[PDB]
Amino acid sequence: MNTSVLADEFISHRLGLIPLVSEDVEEMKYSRDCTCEDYCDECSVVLELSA
Amino acid sequence: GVKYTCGACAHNFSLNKSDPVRCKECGHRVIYKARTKRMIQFDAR
Amino acid sequence: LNIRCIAKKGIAKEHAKWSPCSAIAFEYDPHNKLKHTDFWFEVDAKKEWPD
Amino acid sequence: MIIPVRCFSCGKVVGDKWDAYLRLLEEGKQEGDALDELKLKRYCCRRMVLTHVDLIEKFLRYNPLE
Amino acid sequence: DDTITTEDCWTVISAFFEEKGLVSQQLDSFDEFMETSIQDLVWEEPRLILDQPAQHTNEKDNINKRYEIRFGKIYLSRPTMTEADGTTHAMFPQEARLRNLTYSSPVYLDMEKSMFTSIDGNKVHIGKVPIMLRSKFCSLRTLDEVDLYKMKECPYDMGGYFVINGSEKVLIAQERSAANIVQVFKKAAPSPISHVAEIRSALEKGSRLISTMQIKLYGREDKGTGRTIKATLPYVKQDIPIVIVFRALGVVPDGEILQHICYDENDWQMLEMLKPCIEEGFVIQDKEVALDFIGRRGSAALGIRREKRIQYAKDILQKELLPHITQEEGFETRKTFFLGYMVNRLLLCALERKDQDDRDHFGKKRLDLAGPLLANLFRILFRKLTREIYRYMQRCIETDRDFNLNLAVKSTTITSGLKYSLATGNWGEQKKAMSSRAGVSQVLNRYTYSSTLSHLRRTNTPIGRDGKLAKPRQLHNTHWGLVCPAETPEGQACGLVKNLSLLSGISIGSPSEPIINFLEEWGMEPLEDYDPAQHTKSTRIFVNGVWTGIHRDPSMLVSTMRDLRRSGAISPEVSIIRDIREREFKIFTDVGRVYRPLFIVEDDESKDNKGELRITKEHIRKIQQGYDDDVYGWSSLVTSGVIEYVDGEEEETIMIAMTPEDLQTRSLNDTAKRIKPEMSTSSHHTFTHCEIHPSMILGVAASIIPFPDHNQSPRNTYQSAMGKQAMGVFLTNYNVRMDTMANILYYPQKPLAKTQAMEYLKFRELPAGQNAIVAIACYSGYNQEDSMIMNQSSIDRGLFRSLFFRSYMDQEKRFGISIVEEFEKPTRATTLRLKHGTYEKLDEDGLIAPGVRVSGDDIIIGKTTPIPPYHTKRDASTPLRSTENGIVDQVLLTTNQEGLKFVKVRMRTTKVPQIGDKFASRHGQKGTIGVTYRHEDMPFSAEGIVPDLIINPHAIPSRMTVAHLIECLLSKVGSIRGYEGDATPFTDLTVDAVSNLLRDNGYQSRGFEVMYNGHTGKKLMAQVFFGPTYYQRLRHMVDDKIHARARGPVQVLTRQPVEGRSRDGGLRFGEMERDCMIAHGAAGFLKERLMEASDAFRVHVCGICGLMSVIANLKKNQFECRSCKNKTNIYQLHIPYAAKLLFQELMAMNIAPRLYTERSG
Amino acid sequence: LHKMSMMAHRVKVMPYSTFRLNLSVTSPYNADFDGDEMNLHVPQSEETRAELSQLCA
Amino acid sequence: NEDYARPEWMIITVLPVPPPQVRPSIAMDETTQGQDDLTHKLSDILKANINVQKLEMDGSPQHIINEVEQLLQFHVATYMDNDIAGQPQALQKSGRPVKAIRARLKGKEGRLRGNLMGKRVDFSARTVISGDPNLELDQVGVPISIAKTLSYPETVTQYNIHRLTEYVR
RNA sequence: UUGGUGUGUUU
Ligand SMILES: [Mg+2]
Ligand SMILES: [Zn+2]
Ligand SMILES: [Zn+2]
Ligand SMILES: [Zn+2]
Ligand SMILES: [Zn+2]
Secondary structure: OOOOOOOHHHHHHHHHOOOOOOOOHHHOOOHHHOOOOOOOOOOOOOEEEOO | OOOEEEOOOOOEEOOOOOOOOOOOOOOOOOEEEOOOOOOOOOOOO | OOEEEOOOOOOOOOOHHHOOOOOOOOOOOOOOOOOOOOOOOOOOHHHHOOO | OOOOOOOOOOOOOOHHHHHHHHHHHHOOOOHHHHHHHOOOOOOHHHHHHHOEOOOHHHHOOOOOOO | OOOOOHHHHHHHHHHHHHHOOOOHHHHHHHHHHHHHHHHHHHOOOOEEEEEOOOOOOOOOOOOEEEEEEEEEEEEOOOOEEEOOOOOEEEOOHHHHHHOOOOOEEEEEEEEEEEEEEEOOOOOEEEEEEEOOOOOOOOOOOOOOHHHHHHOOOOOOOOOOOEEEOOEEEEEOEEOOEOOOOOOOEEOOOOOOEEEEOOOOOEOOOOOOEOOOOEEEEEEEOOEOOOOOEEEEOOOOOOOEEHHHHHHHHOOOOHHHHHHHHOOOOOOHHHHHHHHHHHHHHHHOOOHHHHHHHHHHHOOOOOOOOHHHHHHHHHHHOOOOOOOOOOOOOOOHHHHHHHHHHHHHHHHHHHOOOOOOOOOOOHHHEOOEOHHHHHHHHHHHHHHHHHHHHHHHHOOOOOOOOOOOOOOOOOOHHHHHHHHHHHHOOOOOOHHHOOOOOOOOEEEOOOOOHHHHHHHOOEEEOOEOEOOOOOOOOOOOOOOOOOOOOOOOOOOOOOOOOEEOOOOOEEOOOOOHHHHHHHHHOOOOEOOOOOOOOOOOOOEEEEEOOEEEEEEOOHHHHHHHHHHHHOOOOOOOOOOEEEOOOOOEEEEOOOOOOEEEEEEEEEOOOOOOOEOOEOOOHHHHHHHHHOOOOOOOOHHHHHOOOOEEEEEOOHHHHOOEEOOOOOOOOOOOOOOOOOOOOOOOOOOOOOOOEEOOOHHHHOOOOOOOOOOHHHOOHHHHHHHHHHHOOOOEOOOOOOOOOOOOOEOEEOOOEOOOOOOOHHHOOOOOOOOOEEEEEEEOOOOOOOOOOOOEEEEHHHHHOOOOOEEEEEEOOEEOOEOOOOOEOEEOOOOOOOEEOOOOOOOOOOOOOOEOOOOOEEOOOOEEEOEEEEOOOOOOEEEOOEEOOOOOOEEEOOOEEEEOOOOOEEEEOEEEEEEOOOOOOEEEOOOOOOEEEEEEEOOOOOOOOOOOOOOOEOOOHHHOOOOOOHHHHHHHHHHHHHHHOOOOOOOOOOOOOOOHHHHHHHHHOOOOOOOEEOOEOOOOOOEOOOOEEEEEEEEEOOOOOOOOOOEEEOOOOEOOOOOOEOOOOOOOOOEEEOHHHHHHHHHHOOHHHHHHHOOOOOOEEOOEEEOOOOOOOOOOEOOOOEOOEOOOOEOOOEEEOOEEHHHHHHHHHHHOOOOOOOOOOOOOO | OOOOOOOOOEEEEOOOOOEEEOOOOHHHHOOOOOOOEEEOOOOOOHHHHHHHHHHHO | OOOOOOOOOOOOOOOOOOOOOOOOOEEOOOOOEEOOHHHHHHHHHHHHHHHHHOOOOOOOOOOHHHHHHHHHHHHHHHHHOOOOOOOOOOEOOOOOEOOOOOOOOOOOOOOOOOOOOOEEEOOEEEEEEEEOOOOOOOEEEEOHHHHHHOOOOOOOOOOOHHHHHHHHO
16 A cells, blocks of 8 residues: 555665665575465565555 | 545545535545555566 | 565666675776876876876 | 665665765765765765755645645 | 955845746736736727617607616636536636636626617626736735645746646747837839838737838839839828828928928938929829828728718828827827938938848837737727627617616627637637637646746747748847847747747836826927927937927936936836937837846946946845845845846947956966957946846756857757756646646756756756766767667666656536436447457446556546447547556546536556667757666776766767866766856856866866776776766657557548558658659559558549449449440559549549550550 | 668667667768657568669668 | 530539548547538539529529529639639638638649658658667668567468468467 | 647657
8 A cells, every 4th residue: 555755666666776685695596486476485575564 | 436535635435426526524526536456566676 | 655575586687776786996007017008198197197 | 856775876875874964964064074974985976965956855745635 | 345256146146036036927917917908908998889869660759869888897806616516616726727627717897888868787707817827816826835735836836827728828928020110121122112111000008000101112223213202001002102191191382391301401412312202292282182182092982072082081191090109180290200200211221321220130029928918819809799799789779678788798708719719829719710820829838847947938930931031030139138049949940939038027018108207307398399400409209109309418318217217216127228329219118128137337437336336245235134224125126226127229229248357457378267358449438237147148948058158059059959858847746736748757966067047947956867977988889979878777776767647538528408428337238339458447437446557558438428319328438548558646536617527547657768768968969878788888987986878979079069078077076076066157167177176186187087898807098088967858768759550540531541650650651752762763662652552442444435434333243334335345443542532533623534545646 | 862862771670679770871861860760661572672672772 | 626625615514523432521529420621512502503593483683693693603613722813712610711622632732742642651660760880781670569560471482381380370 | 530720849
């Protein structure tokens, strides 16, 4: 749910620029060869946010 | 059935394709639909 | 504002939101002893290009 | 509008350094010296904060849409 | 005091642009309209009179039943939306724009109907005058920016423009020729007529054309033996001699005509050219016989005897000739002495004691804004109202009914007229569609903010386009500070279109009568005591086109009056202008003079201010307090005597230095600075004016440009005519506005080469581009001729990524009292002609819910009409365009003007700046994104900086735009020292200061850093020049001009494929393409093109009469040339359908093309 | 404007939707790259294909 | 010449009617047909025709004849030409002039220069260009969508079956 | 899947 002063793909863009920790990342596989049809908890870090 | 959002008092009121379309609180005649029940998607690039 | 993101694993080739790092200096032979570079110069080559 | 995240040229994340930049401006600093203190030394992360002009305050000047 | 520096002039500009804002010219003259013009257009012709007097098959009932209506006061208010419900409420410009409304007010009027009894109907809404935004008589002049966000109006909006049928329209200041000035033009040679003295008349009140007296010197250069002249008059059919029309105006003898005209009995050359005029005009010797003579040509009617023939001639010489001077009589001295000045003048120019006059000397023109335009069109439909009431009166007096007048005003008249005449601007009554000045009012453009800022100021020129003449297209040199020497479009408009400068103001229109009182207030002498032999040296004085008297010494008077404008006894925008050369002295008060301000140099050796500027620093401290030391804005400067206004006529009589360091004569040989001229001609000048600032000569889309004073001026014109196509932020309320075009540029940066002028277009607080990294270096041939390189990773970081908005529309129609429309989801059964998209995305109520991803070719607004008397509904859906994708924002739903429903939808998506998208420098070095490189493959300097935009070396050295380099350098320095460097032109900012600062902050002096290959790191042999610069985004993309077409839509009329992109038309394989196909000669390709990928069409011919009359039944397979009884001599052909169209058209005009298929001889 | 202003070519298929050229052909068509439009007619027969390929190349 | 141009044929007793392809009705707003101006003008001609034949069948005041005949001549004049010198034009129901047959033939956008000598056609395409030196001299870049839209008919022969079947696939 | 006018912009 969005009702902001900012549009949507705008905020998805800015979220795409956000720095994460990936120190442990090589035991996480690539998305396009991970053994799930659309996302599960083998290859995702699901952020749900609602401020 | 649709939440027609009021343009003035933010009231979620559905109209039965029959009601004259105004604000129930001040006569403000502007409505808009609200967002769907679906989930929107984006690829964040 | 209620948002739900997935996090998946891409490289800078897909897009630069997966940039690991920021800015890379690089230099070799700071005194041009190979004459690989050639200065443009008004007056005199030694004076104007700072060390 | 509102501060971007990285630089446009290099890619050092800068977006956090907006609020600190205004707070350093409040004391009477000069803008170059304020960028000096924040460790912004290439001009890439100097134009990504120095030029930037702020509209989203004006968007929150709209007394409530809903 | 001290030196008035540069920033002191920026104090001056802050006071000006905090008083007026920008668009004074709309607002203040529209205030003039609403305050006075309608009151006087009503009280122009206030009464009608009927009478049905006598012999009504009467009992000799001789009764002057005179039916007399007198119009009175107007009533003015807020706009009002009377609902279909009937309720009235305060409409507002948001509620206007959302609802296709017309921001229009009640204009009421009371009617004083009276009756003569000499025997021998309340506040009607008479019309809706639409109200401009931000006016006094809009409800948003006042009221609290806080509440303006509560009322959806942006504070950095400025208004100026109107609202019609929803959308926004504007008024171009249309540019008419000046009235009532005594011109002389010379005529072209293949003609017996060489010199001309012309005028165009128009009444003082009202400003409306009536007469056009013309003079034509008979005589080519030594052709036309009698070198005498005739006149041409209004309401005649033929040229009439000069001395005869003199004797017609009431001066018969030869001696008094030479006394009126001639000023020198020793000017025997001109006196010699005089004599044949009198010797030709001998045959008409006194007044009434000349009156009878002009009765014979000019519409005095046949058989209408001498006394009424001569009456009519006295009417064309009472009214209908020299009307603007006066329309009462008794001042034949005023009339004839005006014409004696004309004869004086035309003989001055025919002996060439002068140049010819020229068309474009810009004081000799005027301008028409919203004020005079509403005056004219209101006058027109007001006369139409007059005769409508008159029509209804002569029907309800025959049957003699006490009419209430409230069914006697069908007030769709003036509302319908003004609504159409700003809807398309075909300016006039719609039943005067052609012969009318087309394109008055325009769609206002909201693509970006500065574009609107220019476009609200724009003037246009009606020469038409008939005449390719380069004299009206010249930048003629009255233009200093009045129009824009940069901005004008490319092509058909060029030379015409004049953007009012950043020091333009529009002079309103003022009571000339107190100015007359100022004239006679000092002993100006009247016109009836005038003998030029008694006074040859007196000064003859004009008020807007009437010579009103004479006086000896203009100097004391221009001192007094010029100081009374320096005080304020006059309107301070009235140009009191002196000449000394003509022994003449004019005062214009006219509407539409383009004035400009200058710093009043103390031009007078009376005190030590002489040579210096009168502007003190105490005034500067006063402007920085905001008040005077017991309100002090720009108005008090104007009424202080520090700044005087001049229009183009006083531009003749001034003396300017450019900058205030040139007023004192200054102190060398430094090779950084610029070289002002010495001005050592006058040892002791009297400078009267010095410029406030030179970058105030520009237009609004011209002051944006960083250093315009270092370029080749076509690139200045290009940059000004591209600055309007920036993507940016247009107004800050794009959430609530619904407009068909809107685009937000994401990340807008104020340019590091800001000006000092961009404070006053707010562009540093609403920019329309970015600073990306310039690196002018041929890299891999991809910037060969003006293409460029762009780093894809920088776009991925968000470079210039673009919001895209669009508003659609639909409404309900009513096809019967019980038969209306309904936006519903149509079935696949009950409804006719479903669109070949799907319907799934529609909802229960016909309008798609937001949040839903939308593609092209599928519905949003399904307007189903049931066919008036299964399968009885019409599918008339309004779809999304065939090119677009998106996700939907804010789906408006409401009620129309009509009372039925109404819709508007604001779809949106976001466009990635990709390969082919045009970009632009700030010096025109434009082009497309040639290629995209990822991050590592760029060249990169010693620290890690890569670039993002790589214009070509070969783009520079011929285009000669050295300002672009100066911007890049100043950019890099102001980045590193971290502040925005003043690049407003014409300062002492050289290149040397920038060079020294870049070096002394630890760099190379002339820009270069040693950059590398990204594919080796083997150093690039030459050092590469490299920095930031301000970039922008022009409105074109490649996703709007790609198109290809196999087949599809053909017109019914000609079966050749259709025209336009929007219907997926086809291209015009035009004439000169066929020419080059002939030159190559391979005509078999041409027979492919004009037969086979077009209207291939098959007909038949009877071989005897050769025609195509042969009726073709095919499944019965029979034929009959019915003019011949031919059934066998039958062939078919293969011709273009348009060629067949030619044949049917011709045979319907009776020419007979007959096609015999064999050579005959 | 002259008999080279239509010239035949060959097809190379590229993404990223613009027309690509050689830059030696910039002189005869007189095209720069500040946004010109250049059209592309297509033969629909064998005959016209050989016509173009032997003369207008 | 007798069998082709016999100068009693330069006076029209019988003015033909073209078929309605040359004046076909246009959907004003998808229920009502605004007519082409030829239909309006042939209707005006037939109205003045019947008001001619009305006079010789009753009491006729001898210049009522003359004016209705001269009006007939006027309507036949504006059927082929609304540009005749000296006289005002034939006018429509908007304030616009009438589209004659002469206006359908002269001018830049008539049928010949606008439709026959040069016209619009199909199998075209159009875009904005870009330089690319990594190419030969006889090569031009093709965006993919333009390759999708346009096509070329290659004949199915005995030496190209396999690829063309693949292009089906 | 309208016509027909008219305006502004691209080379
Ligand atoms: Mg060009
Ligand atoms: Zn998984
Ligand atoms: Zn409400
Ligand atoms: Zn940076
Ligand atoms: Zn025949």
